[PDB]
Structure formats: structure tokens, C-alpha cells
Amino acid sequence: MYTMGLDIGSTASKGVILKNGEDIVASETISSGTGTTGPSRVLEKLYGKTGLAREDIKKVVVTGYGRMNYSDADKQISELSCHARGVNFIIPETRTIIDIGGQDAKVLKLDNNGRLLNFLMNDKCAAGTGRFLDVMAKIIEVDVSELGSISMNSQNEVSISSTCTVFAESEVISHLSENAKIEDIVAGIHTSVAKRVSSLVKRIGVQRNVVMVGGVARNSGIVRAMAREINTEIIVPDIPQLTGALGAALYAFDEAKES
Amino acid sequence: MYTMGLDIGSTASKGVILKNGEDIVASETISSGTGTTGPSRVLEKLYGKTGLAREDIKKVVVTGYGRMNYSDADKQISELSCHARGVNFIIPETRTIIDIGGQDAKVLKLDNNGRLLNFLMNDKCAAGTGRFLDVMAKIIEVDVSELGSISMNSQNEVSISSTCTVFAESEVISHLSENAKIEDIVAGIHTSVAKRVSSLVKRIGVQRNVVMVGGVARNSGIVRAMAREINTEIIVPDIPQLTGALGAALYAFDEAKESQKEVKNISA
Ligand SMILES: Nc1ncnc2c1ncn2[C@@H]1O[C@H](COP(=O)(O)OP(=O)(O)NP(=O)(O)O)[C@@H](O)[C@H]1O
Ligand SMILES: Nc1ncnc2c1ncn2[C@@H]1O[C@H](COP(=O)(O)OP(=O)(O)NP(=O)(O)O)[C@@H](O)[C@H]1O
Ligand code: SF4
Ligand SMILES: [Mg+2]
Ligand SMILES: [Mg+2]
Ligand code: NA
Ligand code: NA
Ligand code: NA
């Protein structure tokens, strides 16, 4: 039996085909979100990768910012619910989930059943989201996928004074003009993001286990900086960007059984 | 006697030479601010215009973000004080001053003596400042100096949902690709700034007369949107970007008069 989960976010589309509600047999991420062909391309690839087709998929659930714009799913479900479900599937005793995506940062507090108890989100400021990193990566002319590894080489982190993405961009341009080492600039960029999200997490009250998800959690430098700022161990799935899609796939499995 | 005021902000350098504390005989704005050659260029132009030299200026006061980086002044004075002094010299009965500059927006409430009663500033965020406008002007490919006139033609302003400069830029890009009328895009951009600064004004409590200063006050579209959002008439000086430098020049005059009053001049 197979179900599918689709998470169409501001920035990327993620898909998972789940086997018997327990085994991920295919996952795919396309860095095109709401308002693009990203969803279609994710599907194409999940199908090519598995050999399956739409007919073989008993239930599909879509989540994320673009979920109501998608008309080919059995249910459209909140990404708060889907990320919580996906994380709880992988990591026991999760009480705090930090989802840093392309346009917002979400912090979920869960009870002992995995149900939402409290929630705080920054969705109004590009700083402390993936958008900040995307902007900086473009200026430094490296892929966001390299920022973690680059920051590892830092021995003399540059401080970024500005908390605003726009003002920070100017600072980074100025550091680049002063021939600051790219690894130190990037380390400072990671610290800026971690300070802004950490403030968010501290307002809700850290409770272990603390789990980071979202595409930004693929950046090892951000995760390290975050664990430093919140002074708590952070657990990151090997598939942090796909937890919403996985959670959708699990709700899809619930639907398929109910049928 | 002549005195000089320099206002070295984040974005532009402004200078005024004032004669006998009453007549502006020269002014100059260069769109390079702190950390640049802006200040030296301002000086060159004031001196060129007037045919004066440093030795002819009795007192110099510097203000603005860059004031402490400047070492050739007699005093370095707060830009809150300098804008208030400059505005009060030009516009009687002023009680609210809105200074929208290149990196922050300041709202000053003054008492009946021109002294600061209350103050709010948005300073950490590019939105609601000249930076926001400079960013948008670049994207829509018009000069910031044309925004005011363009916006006059708007009849159905576009919506900008985002309050963040970065997210708003993406909306403006989308509007341009959707072929929305430029004047309606510009009106929406103005409304974004005005909503953000008007929230500060409303928090402090609007009190007439309300005066707008700073380089952004040269944008008539921002002035109109602000007056709309605060539901109050706004007065703009003829030289809104220069009120800080004027205030500095007036404090410089005060210094000069203080020096004169501490001696006696005896002749027969
Ligand atoms: N390989 C990578 N390494 C590090 N960071 C990455 C990588 N790929 C993407 N990112 C970051 O991940 C972000 C997108 O994460 P993602 O969780 O897919 O956002 P989204 O769900 O589309 N947006 P939202 O609506 O905010 O949830 C981008 O903005 C990048 O900064
Ligand atoms: N001719 C013009 N028409 C409309 N707007 C203008 C014009 N010239 C400059 N501006 C705006 O005015 C700005 C700078 O204003 P100004 O008050 O000189 O800032 P500043 O004092 O250097 N910075 P701050 O440190 O924040 O006070 C730019 O960011 C522009 O948006
Ligand atoms: S601080 Fe900068 S990044 Fe944050 S909302 Fe303001 S303009 Fe956007
Ligand atoms: Mg997401
Ligand atoms: Mg100023
Ligand atoms: Na992943
Ligand atoms: Na200017
Ligand atoms: Na002016």
C-alpha cells in the first residue's frame, strides 16, 4: 500500500511516497514553491523514482503555504499538524519543534500526545528565515547548500551588527569589500539567524526534546549556532526539509485505512 | 558673522551657512553620508558658493549619525535637538516633527517651548524609511525624485500585504510582471511607508502643527500618504532635508553669541 504527502511551501515543494504507513520509498525536493511547476515536477520525480503512478497511490494529502491552491489531494492539512506528525514519527519525546522555512520561522510546543500546546511564529520579517540566507548567499555568490561547510572553516567570525536583512546585506557587502574571509562572514551570518530564531524559541520556553526542521535545518552551521544560542541539545532528522511532507503522508495513510 | 551647520546622516551630508543667525546664505546636500567623502564635498560647495573659507566661519556645529566621526566642529549636537531647532526657526507653533531619513524615522513631540516631550524611533528596520523607497525605486526603475509626481496619477493603488522591505520587494516585482500601472505600484509603496511611520505618530499622539522633514519629505507622495494616514494636515518646509543642518547652524550661532557676550569691546 502507498500514500503520498506533498508540502508546497513559499520556497520549495517537497513530496514523500510512504509504504504501509511506515517506510519512505521516495522523497523529492524541488526549490520552486507556491505558484510554480515545482509541485508537478516533484510528482514526476517521485513516480519515476518508484515506478508507481497516480493510480497506485491510495491517498494523497497536501500541506504548506500553497496547499489550498492544489486541487488533486484527498485532504489539505495544516503544516503545523503535518510537521508535528512527521517529527513525532522519527523522534520520540519531542516537545519543541523549530521549523525554519523560506518565508517564516515557526516554533511549536507539543504535549505528551504530540498535540500543539503553544505556538509562536515570525512571518513578518525576512530576518531569521531562509530568505535571509538566500539573500546573503546570492551576495556572496555561493549556494545555500554550501554555507554550512563554509562556516566550518571560520576561525575569526565577523559580527553582523544589523538585525535587518536589508541593512545586513550592506554590512556583508562592506565586509566583502574589506576582504574579510568568506568563512568568517558566513559564520557571522549564521549567528545572526540563530540569534533571531533563538529569541523566538526562548519566549515559548525550551522543552526537550528540541527538534529543528525545514530546509534551513539542512545547514549544519545554523543548527550548531542555534544549539549554542538556546543552550540546549537540538535533534535534527536526516531529512529535516521533508517532515511536513512525511506528516502529510502519514495523515494520508490514516485516510487510506479509514476507507 | 557666519556660522555653519553640518548634518552627516546615514545617507546624505547636509550643510548650511547662516548669516547673523537669521539668513541662510548657502546650503548643500550631497547624497553620500557617514563614512564617505560626502562631508568634505558639502564643504567645498558651501565655500565655492559663498566665496568664504574656514577662517570666515566663527562657529561650526555638526549633527547626525556621523557627528562623532567629525573632528573639525566646535560642538557635536544631537539631531533631535538640531531638527527641532531648525523646524522651530521656520515653522511657528510646531508640536510634532516627523523626520524620515535614509536609515531611521523619528517622531518628536515638542512642548510649547520647542523642547522634547516624547520621542519614538523606528531604527532597526529598513521598512518605513528612505531605504525602503530607494530599494523600490531601483526595482521599478525610476529615480526616487520622480516617485511623488508619478504617484499623483494613481487612481487604484495596488495592495502590498508585506510590511517587510524584502517581502514587499517580491510583491512589487510581481506587480510589475503583472503589468499593474506604475503609478498605482508607486502609490502602494508610499502607503507602505506611511502606514509604518503613521503608527509611530499615532502612538505619540498627533499634535498640530505637524511638520515633516528629512530627505523623504521631498517626496510629495509620502507627504500626501502620511497626511491621509494621520488624518491631519502636514506642513513641509521649503528645505525639509536641511532642517538638521539649519538647527546645527543656529546652535553654532548661539555658541558665537555666547563667546561675544563673555568679553567687552571698548572704543572711543
Ligand atoms: N541544501 C541546503 N542547505 C542549506 N539550506 C538550504 C538547502 N536547501 C534549501 N535551504 C534553505 O531552506 C529554505 C527553504 O526551506 P523550506 O522548509 O523548504 O521552505 P518552505 O517550506 O518552502 N517555506 P515556508 O512557507 O516558510 O515554510 C531556503 O530558503 C534555503 O535558505
Ligand atoms: N529629491 C528627492 N525626492 C524624494 N526623496 C528623496 C530625494 N532626495 C533624497 N530623497 C530621500 O531622502 C533620503 C535621505 O534622507 P536624509 O534625511 O538625508 O537621510 P539621512 O539624514 O542621511 N539618514 P538618517 O541617519 O536616517 O537620518 C533617501 O533615502 C531618499 O529616499
Ligand atoms: S527588519 Fe528588515 S528584514 Fe525585518 S521586516 Fe524590517 S525590513 Fe524586513
Ligand atoms: Mg515549510
Ligand atoms: Mg537625518
Ligand atoms: Na531533507
Ligand atoms: Na539623498
Ligand atoms: Na531640502
Coordinates of C-alpha atoms in Angstrom, one line a residue, chain B residues 3 6 19 40-41 49 90 93 96 99 104-105 108 152 171 178 181 186 200 216 233 241 247 251 255:
Chain B
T3 CA 28.1 80.1 11.3
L6 CA 26.7 70.1 9.1
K19 CA 24.5 84.8 8.4
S40 CA 34.2 67.3 2.5
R41 CA 32.2 67.7 -0.7
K49 CA 29.1 79.3 -3.5
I90 CA 11.0 78.2 10.1
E93 CA 3.6 76.5 16.6
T96 CA 5.0 67.1 16.1
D99 CA 11.9 63.1 10.4
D104 CA 15.5 55.6 10.5
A105 CA 12.3 57.5 11.1
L108 CA 9.4 64.1 18.1
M152 CA -0.3 61.7 -8.2
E171 CA 5.3 41.8 -4.3
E178 CA 1.5 41.6 -14.0
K181 CA 0.1 50.7 -13.7
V186 CA 4.2 53.7 -6.5
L200 CA 4.6 55.8 15.4
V216 CA 11.9 61.5 2.3
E233 CA -2.6 68.5 7.7
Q241 CA 16.2 67.7 4.1
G247 CA 19.4 73.7 13.5
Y251 CA 23.3 76.3 17.7
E255 CA 27.9 79.5 20.6

